[PDB]
N, CA, C and O atoms as a GROMACS GRO file, in nm:
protein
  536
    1UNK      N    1  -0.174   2.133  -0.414
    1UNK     CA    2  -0.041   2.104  -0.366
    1UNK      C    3   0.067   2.172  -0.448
    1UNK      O    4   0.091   2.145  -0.566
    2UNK      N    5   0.137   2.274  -0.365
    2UNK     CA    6   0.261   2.305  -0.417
    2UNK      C    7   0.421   2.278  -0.392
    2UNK      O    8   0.505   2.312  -0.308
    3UNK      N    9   0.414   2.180  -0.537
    3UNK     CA   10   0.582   2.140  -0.503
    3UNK      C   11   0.625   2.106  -0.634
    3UNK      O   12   0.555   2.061  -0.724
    4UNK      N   13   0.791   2.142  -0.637
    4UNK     CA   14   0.839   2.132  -0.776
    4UNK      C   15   0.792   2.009  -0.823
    4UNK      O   16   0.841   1.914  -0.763
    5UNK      N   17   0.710   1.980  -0.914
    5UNK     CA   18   0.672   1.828  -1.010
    5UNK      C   19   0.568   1.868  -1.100
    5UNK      O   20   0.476   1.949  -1.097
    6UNK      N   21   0.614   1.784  -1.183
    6UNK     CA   22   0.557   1.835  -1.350
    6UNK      C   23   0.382   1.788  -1.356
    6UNK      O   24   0.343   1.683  -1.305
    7UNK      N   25   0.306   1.872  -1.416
    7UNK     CA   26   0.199   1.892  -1.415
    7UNK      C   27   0.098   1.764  -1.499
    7UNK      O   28   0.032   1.671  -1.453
    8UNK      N   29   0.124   1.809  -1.634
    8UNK     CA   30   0.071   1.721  -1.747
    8UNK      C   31   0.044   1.569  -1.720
    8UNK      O   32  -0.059   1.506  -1.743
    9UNK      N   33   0.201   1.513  -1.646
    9UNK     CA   34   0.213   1.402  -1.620
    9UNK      C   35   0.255   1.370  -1.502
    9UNK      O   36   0.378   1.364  -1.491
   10UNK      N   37   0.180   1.340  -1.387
   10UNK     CA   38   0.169   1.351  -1.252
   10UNK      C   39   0.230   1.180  -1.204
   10UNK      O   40   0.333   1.147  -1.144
   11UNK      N   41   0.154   1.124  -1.241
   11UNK     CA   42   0.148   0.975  -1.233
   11UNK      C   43   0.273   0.934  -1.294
   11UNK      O   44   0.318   0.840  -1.228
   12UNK      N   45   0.360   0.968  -1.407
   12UNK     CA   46   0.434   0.923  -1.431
   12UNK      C   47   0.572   0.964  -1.343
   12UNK      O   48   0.680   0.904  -1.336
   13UNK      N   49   0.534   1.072  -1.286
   13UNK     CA   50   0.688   1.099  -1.188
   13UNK      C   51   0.663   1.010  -1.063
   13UNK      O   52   0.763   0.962  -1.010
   14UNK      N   53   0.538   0.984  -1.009
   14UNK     CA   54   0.529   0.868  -0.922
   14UNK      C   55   0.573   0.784  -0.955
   14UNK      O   56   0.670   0.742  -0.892
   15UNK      N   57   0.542   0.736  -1.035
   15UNK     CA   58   0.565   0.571  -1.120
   15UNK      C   59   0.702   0.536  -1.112
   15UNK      O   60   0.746   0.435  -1.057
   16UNK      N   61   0.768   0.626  -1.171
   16UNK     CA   62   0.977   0.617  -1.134
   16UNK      C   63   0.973   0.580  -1.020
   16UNK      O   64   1.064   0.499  -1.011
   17UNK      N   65   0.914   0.591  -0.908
   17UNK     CA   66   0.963   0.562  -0.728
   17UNK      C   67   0.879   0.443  -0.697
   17UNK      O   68   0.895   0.385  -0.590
   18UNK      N   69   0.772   0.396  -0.800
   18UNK     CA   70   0.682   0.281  -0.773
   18UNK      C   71   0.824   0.146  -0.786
   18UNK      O   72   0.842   0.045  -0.719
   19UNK      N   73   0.898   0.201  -0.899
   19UNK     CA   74   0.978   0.068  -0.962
   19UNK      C   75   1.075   0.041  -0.861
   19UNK      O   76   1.111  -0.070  -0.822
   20UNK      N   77   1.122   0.177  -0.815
   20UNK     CA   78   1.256   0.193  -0.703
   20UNK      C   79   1.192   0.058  -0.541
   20UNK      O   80   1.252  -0.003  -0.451
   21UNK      N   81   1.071   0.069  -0.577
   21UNK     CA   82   1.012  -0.068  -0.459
   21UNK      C   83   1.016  -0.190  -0.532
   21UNK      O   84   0.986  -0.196  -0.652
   22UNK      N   85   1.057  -0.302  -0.455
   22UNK     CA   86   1.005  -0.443  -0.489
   22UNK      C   87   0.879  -0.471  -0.490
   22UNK      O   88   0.823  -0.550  -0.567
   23UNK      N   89   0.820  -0.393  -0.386
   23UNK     CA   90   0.696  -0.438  -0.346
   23UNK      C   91   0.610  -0.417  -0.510
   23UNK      O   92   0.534  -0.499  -0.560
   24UNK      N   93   0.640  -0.319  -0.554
   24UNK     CA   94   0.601  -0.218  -0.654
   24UNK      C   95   0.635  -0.266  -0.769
   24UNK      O   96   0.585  -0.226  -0.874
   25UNK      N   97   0.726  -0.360  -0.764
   25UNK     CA   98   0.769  -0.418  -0.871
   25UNK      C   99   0.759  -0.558  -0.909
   25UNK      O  100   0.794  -0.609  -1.016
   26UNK      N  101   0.709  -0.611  -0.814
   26UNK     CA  102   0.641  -0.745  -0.799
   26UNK      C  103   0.594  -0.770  -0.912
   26UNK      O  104   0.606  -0.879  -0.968
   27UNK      N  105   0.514  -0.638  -0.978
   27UNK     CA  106   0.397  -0.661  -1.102
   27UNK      C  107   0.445  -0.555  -1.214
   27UNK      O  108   0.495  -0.450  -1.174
   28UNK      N  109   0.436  -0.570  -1.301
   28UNK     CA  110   0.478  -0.521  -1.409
   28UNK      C  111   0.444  -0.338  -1.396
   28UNK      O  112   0.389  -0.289  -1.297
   29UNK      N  113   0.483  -0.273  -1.494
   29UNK     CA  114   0.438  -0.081  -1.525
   29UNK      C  115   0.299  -0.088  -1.480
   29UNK      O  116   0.245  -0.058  -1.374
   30UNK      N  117   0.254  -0.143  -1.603
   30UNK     CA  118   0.101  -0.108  -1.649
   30UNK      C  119   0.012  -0.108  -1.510
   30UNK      O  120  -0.059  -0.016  -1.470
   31UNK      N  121   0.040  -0.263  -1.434
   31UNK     CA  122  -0.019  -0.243  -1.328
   31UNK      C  123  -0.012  -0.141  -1.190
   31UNK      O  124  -0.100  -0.108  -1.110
   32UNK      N  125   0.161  -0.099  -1.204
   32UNK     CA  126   0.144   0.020  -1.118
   32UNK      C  127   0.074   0.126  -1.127
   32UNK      O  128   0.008   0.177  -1.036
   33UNK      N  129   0.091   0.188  -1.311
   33UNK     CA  130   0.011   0.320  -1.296
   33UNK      C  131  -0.127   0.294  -1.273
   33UNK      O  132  -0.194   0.355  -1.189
   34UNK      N  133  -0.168   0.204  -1.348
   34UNK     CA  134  -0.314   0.156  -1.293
   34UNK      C  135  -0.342   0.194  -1.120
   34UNK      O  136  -0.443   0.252  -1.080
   35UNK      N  137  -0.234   0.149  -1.034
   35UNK     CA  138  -0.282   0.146  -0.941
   35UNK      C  139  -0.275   0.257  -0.866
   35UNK      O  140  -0.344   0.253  -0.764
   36UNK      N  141  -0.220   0.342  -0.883
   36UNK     CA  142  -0.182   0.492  -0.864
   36UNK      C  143  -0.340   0.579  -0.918
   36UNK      O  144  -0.376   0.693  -0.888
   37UNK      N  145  -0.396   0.499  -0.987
   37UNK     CA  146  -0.545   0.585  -1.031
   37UNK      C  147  -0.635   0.487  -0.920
   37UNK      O  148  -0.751   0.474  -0.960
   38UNK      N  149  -0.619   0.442  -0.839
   38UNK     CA  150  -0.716   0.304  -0.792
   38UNK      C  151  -0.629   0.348  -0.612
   38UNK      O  152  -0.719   0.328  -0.530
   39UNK      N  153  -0.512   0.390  -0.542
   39UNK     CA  154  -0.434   0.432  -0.433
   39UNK      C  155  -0.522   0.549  -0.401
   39UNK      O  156  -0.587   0.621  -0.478
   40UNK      N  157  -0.509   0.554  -0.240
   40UNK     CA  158  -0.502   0.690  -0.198
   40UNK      C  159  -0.396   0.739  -0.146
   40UNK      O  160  -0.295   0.671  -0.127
   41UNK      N  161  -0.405   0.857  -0.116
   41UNK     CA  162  -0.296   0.957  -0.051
   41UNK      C  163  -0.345   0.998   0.066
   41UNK      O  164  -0.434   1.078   0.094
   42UNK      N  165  -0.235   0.897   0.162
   42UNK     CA  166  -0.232   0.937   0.297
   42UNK      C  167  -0.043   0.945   0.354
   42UNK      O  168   0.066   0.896   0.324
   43UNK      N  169  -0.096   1.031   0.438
   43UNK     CA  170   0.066   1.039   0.529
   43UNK      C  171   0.038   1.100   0.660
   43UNK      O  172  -0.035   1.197   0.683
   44UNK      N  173   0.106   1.028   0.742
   44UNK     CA  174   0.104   1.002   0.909
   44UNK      C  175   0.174   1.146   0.951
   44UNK      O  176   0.293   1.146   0.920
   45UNK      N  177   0.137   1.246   1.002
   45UNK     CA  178   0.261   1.382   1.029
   45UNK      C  179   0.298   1.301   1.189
   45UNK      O  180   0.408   1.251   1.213
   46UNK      N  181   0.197   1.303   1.275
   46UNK     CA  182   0.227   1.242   1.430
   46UNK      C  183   0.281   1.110   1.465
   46UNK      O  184   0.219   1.020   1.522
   47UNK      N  185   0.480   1.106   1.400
   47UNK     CA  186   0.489   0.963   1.426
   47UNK      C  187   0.383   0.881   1.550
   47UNK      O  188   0.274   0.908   1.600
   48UNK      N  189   0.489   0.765   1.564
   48UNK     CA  190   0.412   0.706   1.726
   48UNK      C  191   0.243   0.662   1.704
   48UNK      O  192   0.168   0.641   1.800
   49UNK      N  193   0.192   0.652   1.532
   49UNK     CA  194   0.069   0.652   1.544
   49UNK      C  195   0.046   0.516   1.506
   49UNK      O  196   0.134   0.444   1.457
   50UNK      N  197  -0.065   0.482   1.526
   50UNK     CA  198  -0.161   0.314   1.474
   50UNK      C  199  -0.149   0.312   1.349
   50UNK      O  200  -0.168   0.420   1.292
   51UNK      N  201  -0.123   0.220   1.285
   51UNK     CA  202  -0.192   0.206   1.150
   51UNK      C  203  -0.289   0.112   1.108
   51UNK      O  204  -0.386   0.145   1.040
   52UNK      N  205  -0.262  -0.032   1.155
   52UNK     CA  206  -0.368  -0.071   1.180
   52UNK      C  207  -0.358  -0.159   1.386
   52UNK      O  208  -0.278  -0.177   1.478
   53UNK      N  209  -0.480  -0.180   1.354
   53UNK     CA  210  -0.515  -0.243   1.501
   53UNK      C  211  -0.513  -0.462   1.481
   53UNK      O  212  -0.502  -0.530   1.379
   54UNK      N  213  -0.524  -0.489   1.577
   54UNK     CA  214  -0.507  -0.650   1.598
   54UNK      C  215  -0.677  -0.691   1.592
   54UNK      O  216  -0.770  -0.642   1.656
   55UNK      N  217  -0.678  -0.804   1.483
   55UNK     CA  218  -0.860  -0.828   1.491
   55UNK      C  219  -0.909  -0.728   1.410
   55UNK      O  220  -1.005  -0.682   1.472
   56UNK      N  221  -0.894  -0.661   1.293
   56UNK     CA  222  -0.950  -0.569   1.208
   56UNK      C  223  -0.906  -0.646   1.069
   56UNK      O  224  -0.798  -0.683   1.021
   57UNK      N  225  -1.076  -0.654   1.019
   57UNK     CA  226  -1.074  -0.702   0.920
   57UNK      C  227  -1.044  -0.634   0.780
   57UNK      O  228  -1.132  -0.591   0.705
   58UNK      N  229  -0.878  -0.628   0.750
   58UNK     CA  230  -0.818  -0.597   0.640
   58UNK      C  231  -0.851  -0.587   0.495
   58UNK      O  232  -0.803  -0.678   0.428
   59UNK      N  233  -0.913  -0.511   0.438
   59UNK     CA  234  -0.997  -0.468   0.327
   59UNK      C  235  -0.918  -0.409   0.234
   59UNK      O  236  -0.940  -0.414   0.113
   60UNK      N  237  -0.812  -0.344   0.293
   60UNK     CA  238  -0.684  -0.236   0.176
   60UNK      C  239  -0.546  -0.250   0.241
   60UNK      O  240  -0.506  -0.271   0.356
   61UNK      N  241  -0.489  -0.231   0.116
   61UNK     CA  242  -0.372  -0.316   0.045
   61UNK      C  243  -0.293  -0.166   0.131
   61UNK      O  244  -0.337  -0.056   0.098
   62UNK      N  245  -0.205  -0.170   0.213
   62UNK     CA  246  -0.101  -0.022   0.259
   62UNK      C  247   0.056  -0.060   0.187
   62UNK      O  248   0.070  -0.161   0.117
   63UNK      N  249   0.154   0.022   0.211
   63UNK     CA  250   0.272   0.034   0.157
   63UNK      C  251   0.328   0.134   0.187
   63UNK      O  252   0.295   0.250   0.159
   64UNK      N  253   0.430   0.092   0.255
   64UNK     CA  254   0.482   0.204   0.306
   64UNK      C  255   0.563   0.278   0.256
   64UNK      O  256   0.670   0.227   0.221
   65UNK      N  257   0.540   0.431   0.233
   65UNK     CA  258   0.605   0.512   0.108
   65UNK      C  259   0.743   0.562   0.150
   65UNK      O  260   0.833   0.596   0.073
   66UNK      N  261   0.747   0.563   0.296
   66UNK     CA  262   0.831   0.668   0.344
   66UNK      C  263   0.849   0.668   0.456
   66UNK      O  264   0.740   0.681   0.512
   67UNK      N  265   0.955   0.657   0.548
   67UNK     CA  266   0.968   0.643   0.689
   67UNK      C  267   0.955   0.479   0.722
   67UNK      O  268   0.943   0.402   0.626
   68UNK      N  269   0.959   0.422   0.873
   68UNK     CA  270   0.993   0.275   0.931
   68UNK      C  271   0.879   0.271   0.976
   68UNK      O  272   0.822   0.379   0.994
   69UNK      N  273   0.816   0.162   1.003
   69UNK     CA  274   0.682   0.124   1.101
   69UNK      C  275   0.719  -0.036   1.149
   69UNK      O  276   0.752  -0.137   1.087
   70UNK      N  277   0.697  -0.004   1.285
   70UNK     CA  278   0.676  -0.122   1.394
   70UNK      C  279   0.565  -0.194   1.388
   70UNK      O  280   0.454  -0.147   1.414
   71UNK      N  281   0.591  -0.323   1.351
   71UNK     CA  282   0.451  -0.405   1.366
   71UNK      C  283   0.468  -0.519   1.561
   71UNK      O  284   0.568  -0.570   1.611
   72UNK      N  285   0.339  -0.515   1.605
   72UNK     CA  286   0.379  -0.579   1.708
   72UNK      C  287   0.222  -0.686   1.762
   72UNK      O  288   0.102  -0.658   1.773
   73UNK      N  289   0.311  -0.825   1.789
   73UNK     CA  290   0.209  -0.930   1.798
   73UNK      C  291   0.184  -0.941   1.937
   73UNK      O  292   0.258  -0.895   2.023
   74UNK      N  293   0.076  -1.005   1.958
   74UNK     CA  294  -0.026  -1.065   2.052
   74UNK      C  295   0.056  -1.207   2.132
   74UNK      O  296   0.022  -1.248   2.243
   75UNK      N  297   0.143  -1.255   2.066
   75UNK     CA  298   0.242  -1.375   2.090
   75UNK      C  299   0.352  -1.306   2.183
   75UNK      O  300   0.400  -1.344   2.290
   76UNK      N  301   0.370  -1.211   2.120
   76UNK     CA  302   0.520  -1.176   2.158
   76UNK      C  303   0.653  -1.134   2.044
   76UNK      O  304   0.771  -1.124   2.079
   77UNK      N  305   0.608  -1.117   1.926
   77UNK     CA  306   0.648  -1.123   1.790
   77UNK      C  307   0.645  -0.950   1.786
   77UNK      O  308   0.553  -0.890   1.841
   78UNK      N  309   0.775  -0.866   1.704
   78UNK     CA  310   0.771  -0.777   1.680
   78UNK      C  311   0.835  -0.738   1.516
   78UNK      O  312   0.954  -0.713   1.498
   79UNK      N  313   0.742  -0.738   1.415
   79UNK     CA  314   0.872  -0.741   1.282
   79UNK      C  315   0.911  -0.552   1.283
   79UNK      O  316   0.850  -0.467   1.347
   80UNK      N  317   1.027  -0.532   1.194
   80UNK     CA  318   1.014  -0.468   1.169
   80UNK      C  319   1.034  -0.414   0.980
   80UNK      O  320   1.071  -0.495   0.895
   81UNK      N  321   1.016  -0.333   0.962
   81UNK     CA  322   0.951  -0.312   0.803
   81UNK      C  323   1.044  -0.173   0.772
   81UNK      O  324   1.081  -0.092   0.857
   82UNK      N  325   1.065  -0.168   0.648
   82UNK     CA  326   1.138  -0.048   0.613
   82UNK      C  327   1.082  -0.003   0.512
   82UNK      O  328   0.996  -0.072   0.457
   83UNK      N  329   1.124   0.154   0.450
   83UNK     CA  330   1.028   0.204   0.299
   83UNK      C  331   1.118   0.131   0.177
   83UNK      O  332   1.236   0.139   0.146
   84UNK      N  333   0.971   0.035   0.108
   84UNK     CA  334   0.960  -0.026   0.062
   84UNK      C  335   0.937  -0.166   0.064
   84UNK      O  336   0.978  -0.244  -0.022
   85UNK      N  337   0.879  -0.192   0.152
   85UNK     CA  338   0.775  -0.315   0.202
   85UNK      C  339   0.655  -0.286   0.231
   85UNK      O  340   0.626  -0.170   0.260
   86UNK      N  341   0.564  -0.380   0.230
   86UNK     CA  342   0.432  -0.401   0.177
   86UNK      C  343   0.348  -0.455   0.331
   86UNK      O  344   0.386  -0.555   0.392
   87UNK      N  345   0.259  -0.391   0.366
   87UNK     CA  346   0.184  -0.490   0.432
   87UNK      C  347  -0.002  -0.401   0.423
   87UNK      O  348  -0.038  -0.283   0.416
   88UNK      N  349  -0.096  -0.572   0.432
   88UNK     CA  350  -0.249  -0.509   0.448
   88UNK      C  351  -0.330  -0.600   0.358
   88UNK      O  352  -0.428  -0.650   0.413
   89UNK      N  353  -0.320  -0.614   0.302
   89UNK     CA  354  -0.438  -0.766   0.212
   89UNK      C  355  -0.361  -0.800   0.085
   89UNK      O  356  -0.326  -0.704   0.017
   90UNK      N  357  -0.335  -0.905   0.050
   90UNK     CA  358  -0.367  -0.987  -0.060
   90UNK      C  359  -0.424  -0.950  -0.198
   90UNK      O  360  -0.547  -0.954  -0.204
   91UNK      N  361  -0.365  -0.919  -0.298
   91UNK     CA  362  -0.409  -0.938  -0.444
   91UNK      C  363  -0.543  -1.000  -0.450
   91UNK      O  364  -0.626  -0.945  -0.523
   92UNK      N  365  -0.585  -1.130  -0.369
   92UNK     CA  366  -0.644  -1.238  -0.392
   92UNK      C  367  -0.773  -1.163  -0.294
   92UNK      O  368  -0.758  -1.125  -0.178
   93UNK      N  369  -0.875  -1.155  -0.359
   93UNK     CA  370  -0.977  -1.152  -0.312
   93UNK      C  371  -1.006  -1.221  -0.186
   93UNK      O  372  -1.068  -1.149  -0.108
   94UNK      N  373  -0.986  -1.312  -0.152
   94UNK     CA  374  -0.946  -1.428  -0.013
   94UNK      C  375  -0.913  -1.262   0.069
   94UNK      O  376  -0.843  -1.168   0.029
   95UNK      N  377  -1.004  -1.278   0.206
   95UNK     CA  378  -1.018  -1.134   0.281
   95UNK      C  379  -0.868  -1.216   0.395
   95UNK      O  380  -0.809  -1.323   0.382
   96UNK      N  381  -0.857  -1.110   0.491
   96UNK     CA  382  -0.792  -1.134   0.586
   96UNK      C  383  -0.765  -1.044   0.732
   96UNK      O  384  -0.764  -0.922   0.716
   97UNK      N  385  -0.744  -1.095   0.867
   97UNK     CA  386  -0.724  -1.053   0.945
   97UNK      C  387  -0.643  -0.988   1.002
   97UNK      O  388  -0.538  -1.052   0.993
   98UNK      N  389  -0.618  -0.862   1.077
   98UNK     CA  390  -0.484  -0.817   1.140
   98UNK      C  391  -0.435  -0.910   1.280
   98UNK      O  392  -0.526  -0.956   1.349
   99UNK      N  393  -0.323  -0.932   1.313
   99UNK     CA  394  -0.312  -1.050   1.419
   99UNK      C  395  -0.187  -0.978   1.497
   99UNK      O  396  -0.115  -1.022   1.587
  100UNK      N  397  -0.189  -0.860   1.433
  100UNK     CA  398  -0.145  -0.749   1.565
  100UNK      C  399  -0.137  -0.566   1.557
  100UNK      O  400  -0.211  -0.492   1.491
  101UNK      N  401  -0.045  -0.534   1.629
  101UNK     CA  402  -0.063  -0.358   1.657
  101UNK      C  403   0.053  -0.312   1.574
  101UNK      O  404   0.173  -0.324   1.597
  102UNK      N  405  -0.030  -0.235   1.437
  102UNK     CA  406   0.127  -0.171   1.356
  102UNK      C  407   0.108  -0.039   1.436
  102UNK      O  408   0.007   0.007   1.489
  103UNK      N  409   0.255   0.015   1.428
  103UNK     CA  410   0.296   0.182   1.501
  103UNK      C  411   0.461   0.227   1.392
  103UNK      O  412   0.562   0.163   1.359
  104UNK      N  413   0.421   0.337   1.373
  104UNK     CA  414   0.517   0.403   1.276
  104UNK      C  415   0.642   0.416   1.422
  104UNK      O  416   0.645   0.401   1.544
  105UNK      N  417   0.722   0.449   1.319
  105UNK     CA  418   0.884   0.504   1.405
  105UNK      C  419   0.890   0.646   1.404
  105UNK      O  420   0.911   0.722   1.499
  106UNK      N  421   0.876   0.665   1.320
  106UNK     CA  422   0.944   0.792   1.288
  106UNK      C  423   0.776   0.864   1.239
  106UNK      O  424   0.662   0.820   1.221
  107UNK      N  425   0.851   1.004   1.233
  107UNK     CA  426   0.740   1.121   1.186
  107UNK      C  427   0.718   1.171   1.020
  107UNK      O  428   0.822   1.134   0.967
  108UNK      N  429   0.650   1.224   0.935
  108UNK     CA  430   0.670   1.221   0.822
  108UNK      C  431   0.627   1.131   0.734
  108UNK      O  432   0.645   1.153   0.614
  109UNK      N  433   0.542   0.979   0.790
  109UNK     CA  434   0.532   0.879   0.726
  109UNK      C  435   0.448   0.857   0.623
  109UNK      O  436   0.332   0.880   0.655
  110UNK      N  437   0.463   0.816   0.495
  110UNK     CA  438   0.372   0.842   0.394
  110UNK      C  439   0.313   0.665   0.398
  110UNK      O  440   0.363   0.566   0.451
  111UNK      N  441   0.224   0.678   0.339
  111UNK     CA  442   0.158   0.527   0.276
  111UNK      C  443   0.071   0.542   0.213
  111UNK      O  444   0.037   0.659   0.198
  112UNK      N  445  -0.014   0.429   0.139
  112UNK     CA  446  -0.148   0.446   0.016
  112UNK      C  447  -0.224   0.310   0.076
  112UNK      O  448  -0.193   0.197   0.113
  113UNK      N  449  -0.346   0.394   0.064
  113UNK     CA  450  -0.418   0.267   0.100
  113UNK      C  451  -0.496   0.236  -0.072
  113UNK      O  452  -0.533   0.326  -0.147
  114UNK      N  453  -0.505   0.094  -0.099
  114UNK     CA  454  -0.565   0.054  -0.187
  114UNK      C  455  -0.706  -0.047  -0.208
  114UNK      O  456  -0.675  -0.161  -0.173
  115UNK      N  457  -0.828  -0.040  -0.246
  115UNK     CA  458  -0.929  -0.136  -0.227
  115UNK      C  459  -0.882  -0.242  -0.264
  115UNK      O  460  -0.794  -0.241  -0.349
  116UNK      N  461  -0.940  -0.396  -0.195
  116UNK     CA  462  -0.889  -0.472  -0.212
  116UNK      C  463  -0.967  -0.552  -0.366
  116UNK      O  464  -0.916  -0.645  -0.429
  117UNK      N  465  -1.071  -0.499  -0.392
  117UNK     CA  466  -1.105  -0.543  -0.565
  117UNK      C  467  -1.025  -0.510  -0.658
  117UNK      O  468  -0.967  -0.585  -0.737
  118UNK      N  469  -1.019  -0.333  -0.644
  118UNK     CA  470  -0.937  -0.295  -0.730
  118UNK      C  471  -0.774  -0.375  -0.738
  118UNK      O  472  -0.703  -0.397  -0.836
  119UNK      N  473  -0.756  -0.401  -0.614
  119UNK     CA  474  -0.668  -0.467  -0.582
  119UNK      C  475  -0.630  -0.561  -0.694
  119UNK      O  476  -0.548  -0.557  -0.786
  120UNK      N  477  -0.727  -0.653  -0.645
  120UNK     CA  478  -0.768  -0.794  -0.740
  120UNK      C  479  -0.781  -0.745  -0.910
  120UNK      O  480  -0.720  -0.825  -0.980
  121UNK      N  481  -0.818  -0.681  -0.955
  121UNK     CA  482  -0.872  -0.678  -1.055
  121UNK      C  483  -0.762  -0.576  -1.141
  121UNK      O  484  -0.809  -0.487  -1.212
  122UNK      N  485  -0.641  -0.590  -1.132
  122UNK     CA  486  -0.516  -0.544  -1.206
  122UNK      C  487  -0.447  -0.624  -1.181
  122UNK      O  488  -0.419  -0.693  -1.279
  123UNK      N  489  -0.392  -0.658  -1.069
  123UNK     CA  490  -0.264  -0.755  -1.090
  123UNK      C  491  -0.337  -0.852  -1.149
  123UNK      O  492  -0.290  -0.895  -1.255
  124UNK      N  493  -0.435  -0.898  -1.111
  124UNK     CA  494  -0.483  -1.057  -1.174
  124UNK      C  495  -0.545  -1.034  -1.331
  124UNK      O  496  -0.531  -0.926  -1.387
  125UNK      N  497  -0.605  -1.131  -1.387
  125UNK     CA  498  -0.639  -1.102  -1.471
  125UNK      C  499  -0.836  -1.154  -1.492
  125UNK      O  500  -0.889  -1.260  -1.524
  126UNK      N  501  -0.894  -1.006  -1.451
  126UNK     CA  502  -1.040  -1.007  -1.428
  126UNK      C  503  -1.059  -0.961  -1.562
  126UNK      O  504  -0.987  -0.910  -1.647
  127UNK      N  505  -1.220  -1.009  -1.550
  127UNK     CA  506  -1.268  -0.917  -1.703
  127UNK      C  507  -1.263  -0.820  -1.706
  127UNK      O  508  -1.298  -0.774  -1.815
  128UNK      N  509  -1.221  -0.717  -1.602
  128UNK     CA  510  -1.233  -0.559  -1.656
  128UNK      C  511  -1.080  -0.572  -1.629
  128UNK      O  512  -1.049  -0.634  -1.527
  129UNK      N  513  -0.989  -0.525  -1.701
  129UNK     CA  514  -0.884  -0.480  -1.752
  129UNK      C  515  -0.835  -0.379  -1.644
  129UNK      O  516  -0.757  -0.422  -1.559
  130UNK      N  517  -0.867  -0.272  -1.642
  130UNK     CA  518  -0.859  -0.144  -1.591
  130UNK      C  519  -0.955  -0.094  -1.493
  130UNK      O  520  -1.050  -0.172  -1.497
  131UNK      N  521  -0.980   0.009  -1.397
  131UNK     CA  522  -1.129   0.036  -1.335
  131UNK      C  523  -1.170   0.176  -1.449
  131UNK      O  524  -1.124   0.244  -1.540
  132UNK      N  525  -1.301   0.155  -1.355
  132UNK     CA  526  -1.394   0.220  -1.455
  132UNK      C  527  -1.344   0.394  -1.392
  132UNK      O  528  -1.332   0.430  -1.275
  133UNK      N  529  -1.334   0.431  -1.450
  133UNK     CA  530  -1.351   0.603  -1.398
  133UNK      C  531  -1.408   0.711  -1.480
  133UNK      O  532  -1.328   0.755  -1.563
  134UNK      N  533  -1.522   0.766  -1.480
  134UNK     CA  534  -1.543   0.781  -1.579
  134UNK      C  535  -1.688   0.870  -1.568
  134UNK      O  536  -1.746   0.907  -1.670
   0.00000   0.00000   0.00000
């Protein structure tokens, strides 16, 4: 990937835009950069797309980096979400269900999907500290 951002320290120019979120800030530094080694890198180019489906059993933690996404219920319920809100599983090991149809707004949309152990096992406090990488 070529784009102006400093080499050596990659994670830490993320990390400045982790804090700029609540969502992101919920939990202290340590646990963001942690989680930035434990995130993937995804981004939506074809607004108008799914992100997740209704009845899919939610395993990773999303966040939306960039751009609006439409969430829409089975009731009749439509929220909507802006960059820097959070939606997709729980810290808490406790699994969970989707109970409707998310769809981005706009084009350009970034997000990270995260495992939901790794999940668990930074913000909270598990015996492993950190994940293993290695």
């Amino acid at each position: 990937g070529s784009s102006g951002s400093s080499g050596d320290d990659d994670i830490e120019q993320l990390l400045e835009f982790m804090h700029q979120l609540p969502a992101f800030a919920n939990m202290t530094m340590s646990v963001r950069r942690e989680l930035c080694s434990v995130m993937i890198f995804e981004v939506v180019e074809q607004a108008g797309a799914i992100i997740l489906e209704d009845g899919q059993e939610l395993d990773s933690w999303y966040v939306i980096l960039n751009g609006t996404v439409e969430i829409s219920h089975p009731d009749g319920k439509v929220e909507n979400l802006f960059m820097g809100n959070s939606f997709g599983i729980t810290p808490t090991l406790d699994k969970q269900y989707m109970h409707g149809i998310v769809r981005t707004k706009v084009d350009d949309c970034q997000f990270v999907c995260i495992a939901q152990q790794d999940y668990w096992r930074i913000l909270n406090h598990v015996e492993k500290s950190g994940p293993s990488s290695g």
